[model samples]
Target: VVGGTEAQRNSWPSQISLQYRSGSSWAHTCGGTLIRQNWVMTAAHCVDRELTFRVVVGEHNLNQNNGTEQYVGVQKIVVHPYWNTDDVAAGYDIALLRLAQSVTLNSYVQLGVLPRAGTILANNSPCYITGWGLTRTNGQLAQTLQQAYLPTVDYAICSSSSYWGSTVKNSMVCAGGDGVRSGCQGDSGGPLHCLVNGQYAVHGVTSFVSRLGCNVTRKPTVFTRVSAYISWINNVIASN
Candidate 1:
């Protein structure tokens, strides 16, 4: 994220690195949240390309060993049927990845609790965006994970003129429009963890940012609202 601080190793246990094989090495492409022992929730755009992908759990540092890292191959990919690449602003930019094998949960690796179906956070609710994305606009990827405090921006305001206009929909969550802190490239598919009722839950999946830059005023980091797709997520997991 832009203008973000390095995150604590144990703070976001469910955060994971989604990487793709490039020649002889793997490259970090996106971030995701572990929702089950072998299932991950991420953005559909992250897997739109035809490439070999894998999920790395308990990962804090992408360039070195964190001792808690667990690399697993993706057995199946389930992109939302309604997702359209050309119309990301229309919403439904979510996908699920099923690992080849179930991973053992530990202190450094665990499931991310999702918000209740149709749940909505009040405006300016406390939240944080975590990822290993670029630190600046058009900047290089971070060596380690980072986090930035991003308050919730309600849909009524986000979709209004001067903000995202019609681009921001009710199926998405908007946060960090301060033009200082926001999600960037390689951060897509990460979690937007929000504190509600004394507990933290996954409220969003990082989807896109402003086209002008990583951090732009009135253009918060947009995310696929997790609460809007609770039934779809459950059905996919149950069927698979």
Candidate 2:
């Protein structure tokens, strides 16, 4: 995130660190939300490389273990059938990774709550973007998890010519074009938790940010709307 602060320990239990082997050690590459005991929700682009990947739950800091981390191998990857790497603007950026074994749930690890299908938040809805993504555009990843408050910017305002224009589709959600707080590299595929009726649900999967910078005016962070794919997610889980 361009402007964010260290997240409280165990505050976002569903948040996870998606990592790939880097020589002798694993390195954080993206973020993900644990939606089930054996599945994680992430971006298709994050697994496109087909590298050796693993999901680390209960992980608050990337560089240090807080004694709550649970590392698990990925057993399967199911990218949205309609996903097109060349056309992210078309809105099928989501993916799911089945773990080799189901993980145990605890205060530091739990399934992310999803919004009901077809649910859409009103404009300026309270939300927060959390991840281990860079603190600045093109910068190194954060040593620990970070979070920033980024209220929703409804499709109407986000699709305006001055904002994201047509690139902001109904299949996506936009938040925080404030030019200070937003998702950046390494944050892709993370959760956008929005508060609704006193509960926080995983409403988005971090998709893209402005090409100009991580935080750009009128270019709020874009996310793959999770509610739009609830049916698809259920189908994948049911069939696979």
Candidate 3:
């Protein structure tokens, strides 16, 4: 269930959304991944102090004109203990949202594998990045889901004098070219995907600063490496 449109937005996995509640209506604060029936993977920074949030899975169009949208609320939240709000990796920039209700097995809502740390995923990996986020740093986020092809960026190129310096750690993967392509605001917590053995996985969660615009080759599009936290992810999803 990619975005319910043909414009550059449907090429990504369909299950993910931000969570927020201001009044009677809920809000989507950041993009997120539905890794399982009960677990959602997102950027720790996107969820901080919100008590009643949820992961909306199995739908492309939020409007659900056909009544095809499926959403579940939050039962609990576990942000990575390491993500530092001041520096950006305080709770490790990753988080877990336990669904208040379990999702039924289906094609739209699916699970993915995490890659091993230091495991260099190949170039031209034919992956996708999706979001309701900004198209350009100065642009407005699309109401409909939008997606872009994600290319695995070489570390040497990413850490060059132009990028985030050596701060790009083994716990993360960089994607997109410097200036011409990238994920913008509101795309946070969305999935960076790659297909393995015919199955897709969330390899990265959107994370970056000051590099939101296209053409800034120095600011690499960083992501939280989900594979590095698989054991913890598994424990939470299973034990819960």
Candidate 4:
């Protein structure tokens, strides 16, 4: 994430590193949130490459281990039926990955709390985005997880011509148009933790950023609105 600082250890228990094999090593591709014991929520585009992928839970530092990490192969992947690989602006960018085995919950690993269906944060609601994405546009990934405070930018403001405009939909959430802090490459599919009713919930799945730059003004980070897909998520989990 651009303009971020190292996240506190174990602060984001539901955060995970979604990785793919890179020659002899595994490299981080996107971030995900543990939704169920064996299911993860990520952006569909994150796995578009069809590579060998794994989910790493309880990860803090990418180059070091905290002894709490759990690595599991993805057993199955289900991208949103309406998702179009070339049309992120049309809004169905979500995907669910079923793990080969269920992971145990702990202080360093836990399920992410989802917002109630139809919930929407008011403009300027407090939120923070955490990830291992790049610290700058077209830059290297952070060795550790980083977080930046990015308040919500309601649809009215975010969809104005000067901002994201029609590229954003109600089914998506926009945040941080300050041109200073925002999500970048490798942060895709991560959670946008927003505070609602005195509690934090996973309100979004990192979707896209500005084509201009990661921290461009009036181009706040866009996310797949999780609340809008609660029913879709339930159906997938129930049928699969």
Better of 3 and 4 by lDDT: 4
1-240, model 1: which lDDT tens digit per residue?
A: 999999988889999999999999999999999999999999999999999999999999999988888999999999999999999999999999999989889988999999999999999999999999999999999999999999999999999899999999999999989999999999999999999888889999999998899999999999999999999999999999
Ordering by lDDT:
1, 4, 2, 3
**Candidate 4 lDDT over residue span 48-149, tens digit each:** 897999999999999997899999999999999999998999999999999999999999999999999999999999999999999999998999999999
Q: List the residue pairs that clash in candidate 1.
A: none
**134-223, model 2: which lDDT tens digit per residue?**
898888899989999999999999999999988989999999999899999999999999999999999999999988999998899999
Q: Write the per-residue lDDT of candidate 3 for residues 157-237, one digit (tens) a residue.
A: 665667666677767767775466677777788888877668667788887645445425556567877777778777766
By summed lDDT, the worst window of 10 consecutive residues in model 4 runs over 194-203
Q: CA lDDT of each candidate?
A: 0.96, 0.94, 0.68, 0.95
Residue runs of model 2 more than 4 Å from their true location after superposition: none
Over 4 Å off, model 3 = 1-14, 63-66, 89-91, 116-118, 197-199, 209-215
Taking all chains together, the TM-score of candidate 2 against the true structure is: 0.99
Local lDDT at 64 for model 4: 91
Candidate 3, residue 194: how far the Cα is off, in Å = 1.5
* Stretches of model 1 off by over 4 angstroms after superposition: none
TM-score of each: 0.99, 0.99, 0.84, 0.99
